[PDB]
Amino acid sequence: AGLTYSQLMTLKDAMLQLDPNAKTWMDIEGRPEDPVEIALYQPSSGAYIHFFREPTDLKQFKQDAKYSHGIDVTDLFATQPGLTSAVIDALPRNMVITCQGSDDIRKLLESQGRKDIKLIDIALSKTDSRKYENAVWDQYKDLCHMHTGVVVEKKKRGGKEEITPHCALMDCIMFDAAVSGGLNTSVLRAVLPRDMVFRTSTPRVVL
Numbered sequence: 439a440g441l442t443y444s445q446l447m448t449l450k451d452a453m454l455q456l457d458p459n460a461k462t463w464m465d466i467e468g469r470p471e472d473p474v475e476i477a478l479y480q481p482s483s484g485a486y487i488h489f490f491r492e493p494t495d496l497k498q499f500k501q502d503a504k505y506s507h508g509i510d511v512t513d514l515f516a517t518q519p520g521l522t523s524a525v526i527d528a529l530p531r532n533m534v535i536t537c538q539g540s541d542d543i544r545k546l547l548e549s550q551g552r553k554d555i556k557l558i559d560i561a562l563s564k565t566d567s568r569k570y571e572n573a574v575w576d577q578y579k580d581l582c583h584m585h586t587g588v589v590v591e592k593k594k595r596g597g598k599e600e601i602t603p604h605c606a607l608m609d610c611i612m613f614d615a616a617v618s619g620g621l622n623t624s625v626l627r628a629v630l631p632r633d634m635v636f637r638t639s640t641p642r643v644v645l
C-alpha cells in the first residue's frame with residue numbers, strides 16, 4: 439500500500455540532504471487534494487526532490503492536463519504509491535518553504551498534518567514568474583520528460599493558443615531565478631534515488 443521499511447529508511451537518509459535552514463522552493467502540478475507532480479528545490483546546493491503520483495479524480499486530471507501539465511495519465515501508473523505522504527512525513531520539522539502564486543502548497547501540507555512548516559508567499563505576477571521559462575527548459579529539459587501533451591491557454595478575447603507545459607520542477611527553478619534577478623548555470627542533483635520514484639521493473643514482453 440506504500441513504502442517498505444528499507445524504502446522509508448532510504449528516504450529518511452535522503453532527507454538529510456536538505457538543509458533545513460536554506461531556501462527551499464516547493465511546487466505541485468494537480469490539485470492539493472490530488473497532486474500528480476511534486477517538486478522541492480534548494481537553489482543554494484542544487485538539490486531537488488521530484489516525483490509523481492497517479493491521480494484519484496480522472497476528470498479533473500484531464501482538464502489539468504489540457505490547461506497545465508500535459509501529462510499522459512498512463513505514464514503515472516508505475517509511480518510508487520504512498521510516496522507523497524511518505525515524503526511529506528519526512529520533511530525536516532519547522533522548515534520554511536517558499537511558494538508562488540497560490541495556497542496549494544499550504545493546503546497539501548496541512549492535509550497531511552504538517553502545520554509546523556512555515557510558508558513564504560511570493561506574490562510574483564504570472565507574467566514575471568515565467569520570465570526565465572524558455573531558458574530554464576533549455577538548460578534543464580532533460581530533467582523532466584513527463585509533459586508530453588499539447589497544453590493550451592484561453593485567450594484574452596476568446597479562442598485558445600498553445601503554451602509551454604507547466605512542470606513543478608521547472609517552476610521551482612524559474613521562480614527562484616525570477617526572484618533572484620538572474621538564471622544561474624548550476625548542476626542540479628536529485629535527492630531521491632531513481633529506484634524509489636517509479637515502481638515496476640518486470641518486462642511486460644520478451645522481445
Ligand SMILES: [Mg+2]
Pocket residue numbers: 465466467605606609
Ligand atoms: Mg505548480
Ligand SMILES: [Zn+2]
Pocket residue numbers: 475582583584585604605606607608
Ligand atoms: Zn515535470
